[PDB]
C-alpha cells in the first residue's frame, strides 16, 4: 500500500529522475488523504521539477493541519522572497527557528537579509553560463523537428519545458540580485 510508494518514490527522487518519483508520490495519496508526511515529499519533488505552483499547493495542504512537522517547516522555503518580490519568506524562517534549531533553517535566515533593501544583455547577465543553453534551446525551436511525438508528449513540449524552467529561474535570480543593485555594486567598487 502506502509504504511501497514512499520508499521507491523517495529513492527515485534521490536518483535524479523527478517526474516518475512524483507519480509514485501521487499514487500514495490514493491511500489516505491528510498525510502531511507525504505532502511535503511531493513538494520537495515538485520544486526540483521546474514548476512551482503545485509544490506550493502541496506545501500549504501539508501545513494546514498543525505547525509542528519540522520537515514540512523546511518546505515553505519556496515562498515569495525566494520566488519573486523582495520580502516575505523570513517571516516563516524565523518561526521555524522558534522550533528546533535545525541548522538548515538558519541557512534561509542568513539568506533572507539586507537584499530586502534592494534582452540579450539582460539574459546573459541574469543567467550564468547556462545562458548559452537558454538561447540554444530557443534557437532549436525554429525548425520542423518540433512537431514530433516521443512518448505521449511532444518534442516541442520538451524543447519548451527546459526553456520554461530557465525563464522561471531567470526571474528567481533577478529577484535575488536586482540589476539595479548590480550597478550600485560596480559603481561603489570603482569609486572606492
Amino acid at each position: 500500500t502506502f509504504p511501497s510508494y514512499m520508499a521507491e518514490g523517495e529513492r527515485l527522487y534521490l536518483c535524479g529522475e523527478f517526474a516518475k518519483a512524483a507519480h509514485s508520490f501521487s499514487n500514495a495519496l490514493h491511500l489516505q488523504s491528510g498525510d502531511k508526511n507525504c505532502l511535503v515529499a511531493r513538494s520537495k519533488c515538485f520544486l526540483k521539477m521546474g514548476e512551482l505552483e503545485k509544490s506550493l499547493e502541496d506545501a500549504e495542504a501539508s501545513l494546514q493541519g498543525d505547525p509542528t512537522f519540522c520537515k514540512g517547516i523546511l518546505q515553505k522555503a519556496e515562498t515569495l522572497y525566494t520566488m519573486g518580490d523582495f520580502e516575505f519568506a523570513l517571516v516563516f524562517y524565523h518561526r521555524g527557528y522558534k522550533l528546533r534549531p535545525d541548522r538548515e533553517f538558519k541557512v534561509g535566515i542568513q539568506k533572507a537579509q539586507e537584499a530586502i533593501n534592494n534582452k540579450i544583455v539582460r539574459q546573459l547577465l541574469g543567467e550564468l553560463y547556462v545562458d548559452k543553453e537558454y538561447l540554444e534551446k530557443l534557437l532549436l525551436d525554429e525548425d520542423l523537428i518540433k512537431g514530433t511525438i516521443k512518448h505521449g508528449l511532444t518534442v516541442e513540449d520538451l524543447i519548451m519545458t527546459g526553456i520554461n524552467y530557465l525563464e522561471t529561474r531567470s526571474d528567481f535570480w533577478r529577484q535575488q540580485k536586482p540589476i539595479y543593485a548590480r550597478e550600485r555594486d560596480r559603481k561603489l567598487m570603482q569609486e572606492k
Binding site: 535524479g16 526540483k48 521546474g50 550564468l128 547556462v130 543553453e133 534551446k137 532549436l140 514530433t148 516521443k150 518534442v155 520538451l158 524543447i159 519545458t161 527546459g162 524552467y165 530557465l166 529561474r169
Partner: peptide
C-alpha cells in the same frame, strides 16, 4: 541553486538526443 538548473538542462538534452 545554480547546480540544479544545470542538472535539468542535461536531462532535457539527453532526451532530445534519444529522439
Amino acid at each position: 541553486m545554480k547546480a540544479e538548473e544545470a542538472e535539468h538542462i542535461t536531462s532535457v538534452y539527453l532526451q532530445l538526443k534519444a529522439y
